[PDB]
């Protein structure tokens, strides 16, 4: 049977990457988390106060509280059969903004631009995304030179 | 005394090297991994006869010794005492365990019985270099040493000069310009890169 210890099996998780030990660069500390900001937790060995538990490493979640130098953050955790949205207080240093959401915001901004325009025109434009379709009919010009013949090569034992 | 080789043939376990953890390991039978005229220059031994494995199996330290002796004995009788160099290229690192029975299967976890080398398919076991005269005697020397191993291994004559990494067709040309430079059994490869004072030692 295994030990229930908090930091069991975080020999590699909470360990600063190669040649990135030492001082935590300050941008980290000086960027603002509001309420409802989606945020991806990722523990960090240096700062040991306010570490999140190993289960939430990798997990992303939304911010619901903002204390002085920590941020309450609702995350989903699975537990055998049931997923539990649960709220953890992680000190800033173990937290980044999840870029996941930003590509969506860009796309909404592009749709709003393309909805204001093309209304006075009349031409309705494709707003939805669409999966990468089959790659269309097209000509291939073997310009002058013929194609190159490829024999499979005869075996030989190298080692 | 010890077990049959049968039981410890297949590469079943994770590698269990002699370390902090695994201690009280009795020493390997094989010790001298090379013999012949090992104090010989690159140019006076180009042939490179390997014994290459064809199974993912474990060779015992005892086997490797017996194979070496076998190959060396015949090499000496054949060509001469100082007309070859044989490099064994599998050291037994992996330790091999032995639950002994005078309780039953309770608390069974072995003491170290001995050591063993793990060999991959296509990996070299033994290797010999000598002269272009002496190809036949090398082949038979390795052939004989096959009989001291389990599984199946091919004997193969390389396209490399000696024990170098450099194709024998290109070797002599690379030496004369000074891409390559003699270095005991080995040969140091000089590249472009290094400060120009290194270049000035050569070409002078």
């Amino acid at each position: 049977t295994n030990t229930k210890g908090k930091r069991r099996g975080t020999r590699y998780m909470f360990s600063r990457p190669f040649r990135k030990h030492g001082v935590v660069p300050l941008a980290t500390y000086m960027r603002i988390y509001k309420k409802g900001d989606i945020v991806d937790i990722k523990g960090m060995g240096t700062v040991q106060k306010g570490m999140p538990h190993k289960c939430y490493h990798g997990k992303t979640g939304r911010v619901y509280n903002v204390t002085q130098h920590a941020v309450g953050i609702v995350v989903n955790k699975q537990v055998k059969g049931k997923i539990l949205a649960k709220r953890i207080n992680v000190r800033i240093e173990h937290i980044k903004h999840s870029k996941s959401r930003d590509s969506f915001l860009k796309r909404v901004k592009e749709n709003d631009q393309k909805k204001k325009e093309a209304k006075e025109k009349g031409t309705w434009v494709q707003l939805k995304r669409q999966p990468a379709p089959p790659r269309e009919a097209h000509f291939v010009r073997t310009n002058g030179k013929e194609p190159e013949l490829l024999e499979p090569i005869p075996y030989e034992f190298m080692a | 005394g010890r077990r049959p080789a049968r039981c410890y043939r297949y590469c079943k376990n994770k590698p269990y090297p002699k370390s902090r953890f695994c201690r009280g390991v009795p020493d390997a039978k094989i010790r001298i991994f090379d013999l012949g005229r090992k104090k010989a220059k690159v140019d006076e031994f180009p042939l490179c006869g390997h014994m290459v494995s064809d199974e993912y199996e474990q060779l015992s330290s005892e086997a490797l010794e017996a194979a070496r002796i076998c190959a060396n004995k015949y090499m000496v009788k054949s060509c001469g005492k100082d007309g070859f160099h044989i490099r064994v290229r599998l050291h037994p690192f992996h330790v091999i365990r032995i639950n002994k029975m005078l309780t039953g299967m309770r608390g069974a976890f072995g003491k170290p019985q001995g050591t063993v080398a793990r060999v991959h398919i296509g990996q070299v076991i033994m290797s010999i270099r000598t002269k272009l005269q002496n190809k036949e005697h090398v082949v038979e020397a390795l052939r004989r040493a096959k009989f001291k191993f389990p599984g199946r291994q091919k004997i193969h004559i390389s396209k490399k000069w000696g024990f170098t990494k450099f194709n024998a067709d290109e070797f002599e040309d690379m030496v004369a310009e000074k891409r390559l430079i003699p270095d005991g059994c080995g040969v140091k490869y000089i590249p472009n890169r290094g400060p120009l004072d290194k270049w000035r030692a050569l070409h002078s």
């Binding site: 001082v23 300050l26 988390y33 | 002078s204």
Partner: protein, 292 residues
């Protein structure tokens, strides 16, 4: 000979420290504490009154910290004090005071709080601090960033602090390290401090040297003697400067133009040139050796 301490391996595993830490300027331990905000303040700034004493200069800046790089709201230098009255001794405590005052006034004119928050005018030296007036825009608040200065009693950093405080910035401070505080008794004078503010410690040393030996005085205070700045002319000089600062702190720069645009430096040697150079050295080495 010995084992080479700095191998390939050494460099391979080696981590450099931050640039400003290498350069020997920024104490990142202190900077973290100084500069970051409480997150629940959010995007409100946290200003620091930076003070840095150079060999011939005193710089005072006010700056908050943004992620792109801490931005400077306002700055005052010692080499501006010639405008206001102070000719000499610009790295000295009294000038440090003036610089800090000048800074504070300049900041206050930007936010229209020049008329509000006059601060301390008479220059006592005592514990002063600015209460924010009700029904009026609150006092500016910043913290003193000393840097790598060994903050001991009578450090010119705190001189600049005093000047700024008297200028009307709510900077927190004790008076434990204003020159005047006694370590072996634990009370403040604030007359001793006053003297230091108005260069009397310099004046007295100027008087003491003239009494003792003319030659040393002439050497020590050459640029003081030039420009005609006597011991008894000192206190007045600083008081005039303070009044000139108070009346108009604004900076106008100089309209810089008419530049030739030429390279003082040496440009970086192109690949091809470097590639050529080695070939010439090789050739040169060959032709030279084919003789002897």
């Amino acid at each position: 000979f010995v084992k080479v301490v700095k191998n390939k391996a050494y460099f391979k595993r080696y981590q450099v420290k931050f640039r400003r830490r290498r350069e020997g300027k920024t104490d990142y331990y202190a900077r973290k504490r100084l500069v970051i905000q409480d997150k629940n303040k959010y995007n409100t700034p946290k200003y620091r009154m930076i003070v840095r004493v150079t060999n011939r200069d005193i710089i005072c800046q006010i700056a908050y910290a943004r992620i792109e790089g801490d931005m400077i709201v306002c700055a005052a230098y010692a080499h501006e004090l010639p405008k206001y009255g102070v000719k000499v001794g610009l790295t000295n405590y009294a000038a440090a005071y003036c610089t800090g005052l000048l800074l504070a006034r300049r900041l206050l004119n930007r936010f229209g709080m020049d008329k509000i928050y006059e601060g301390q005018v008479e220059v006592t030296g005592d514990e002063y601090n600015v209460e924010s007036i009700d029904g009026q825009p609150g006092a500016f608040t910043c913290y003193l960033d000393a840097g790598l200065a060994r903050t001991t009693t009578g450090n010119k950093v705190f001189g600049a602090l005093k000047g700024a405080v008297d200028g009307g910035l709510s900077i927190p401070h004790s008076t434990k390290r204003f020159p005047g505080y006694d370590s072996e008794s634990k009370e403040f004078n604030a007359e001793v401090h006053r003297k230091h503010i108005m260069g009397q410690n310099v004046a007295d040393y100027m008087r003491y040297l003239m009494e003792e030996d003319e030659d040393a005085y002439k050497k020590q205070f050459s640029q003081y003697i030039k420009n005609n700045v006597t011991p008894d002319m000192m206190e007045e000089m600083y008081k005039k400067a303070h009044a000139a600062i108070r009346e108009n702190p604004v900076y106008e720069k100089k309209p810089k133009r008419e530049v030739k645009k030429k390279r003082w430096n040496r440009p970086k040697m192109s690949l091809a040139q470097k590639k050529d150079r080695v070939a010439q050295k090789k050739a040169s080495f060959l032709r030279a050796q084919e003789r002897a």
